[PDB]
């Protein structure tokens, strides 16, 4: 909620969406947010950051992805 951070996600159609995420959000939670916003079922979603797969049960913080509020990562669906 109040400590949420902006991220971008590029979909296969070339659309980039934004999301607000918590440091404690798991990758599955991110996929649910993408479904809720963009309608893509989680079973179709494979997320990567900088070319590395993001695993179920990890958070973005478990990949050291979230920085300060001035730098927003782009995740990519593959």
């Amino acid at each position: 909620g109040p400590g949420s951070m902006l991220i971008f996600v590029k979909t296969l159609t070339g659309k980039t969406i934004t999301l607000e995420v918590e440091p404690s959000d798991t990758i599955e939670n991110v996929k649910a947010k993408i479904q809720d916003k963009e309608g893509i079922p989680p079973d179709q979603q494979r997320l990567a950051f900088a070319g590395k797969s993001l695993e179920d049960g990890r958070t973005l913080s478990d990949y050291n992805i979230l920085k300060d509020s001035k730098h927003h990562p782009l995740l990519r669906l593959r």
Binding site: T13, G14, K15, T18, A50, K67, H72, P73, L74
Partner: protein, 119 residues
């Protein structure tokens, strides 16, 4: 006509503006927009900025090699291979970015509305 013009446009009330081109003036105050990354959708005229290229010293958001977006300032542009590249300064350092790697936050695009808003 605005048809065929390059623009920067958003498709949500609080969203970021992305580069593209107007492909059609359609009903109900909207324009069909083909974004540079391939996404096509109708967008409201109020959400379009007719600036091409984005002018010098504009604050923008740009995708760095490390796959983070962050703010920077436009310092130059180059046309090469039919593509546009922006020189954008972040933390005192300039790099070159493809047009499609340069976007505007809500606040950044609102700064350009008075001069470049459509209509």
């Amino acid at each position: 006509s605005f048809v065929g013009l390059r623009v920067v446009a958003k498709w949500s009330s609080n969203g970021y503006f992305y580069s593209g081109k107007i492909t059609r003036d359609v009903g109900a105050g909207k324009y069909k927009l083909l974004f540079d990354d391939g996404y096509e959708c109708d967008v409201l005229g109020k959400d379009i900025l007719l600036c091409d290229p984005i002018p010098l010293d504009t604050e923008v958001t740009a995708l760095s090699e490390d796959e983070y977006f962050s703010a920077g300032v436009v310092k130059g542009h180059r046309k090469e291979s039919g593509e546009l590249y922006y020189s954008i300064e972040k933390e005192g350092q300039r790099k070159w970015y493809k047009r499609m790697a340069v976007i505007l936050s809500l606040e950044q695009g609102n700064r350009l509305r008075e001069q470049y808003g459509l209509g």
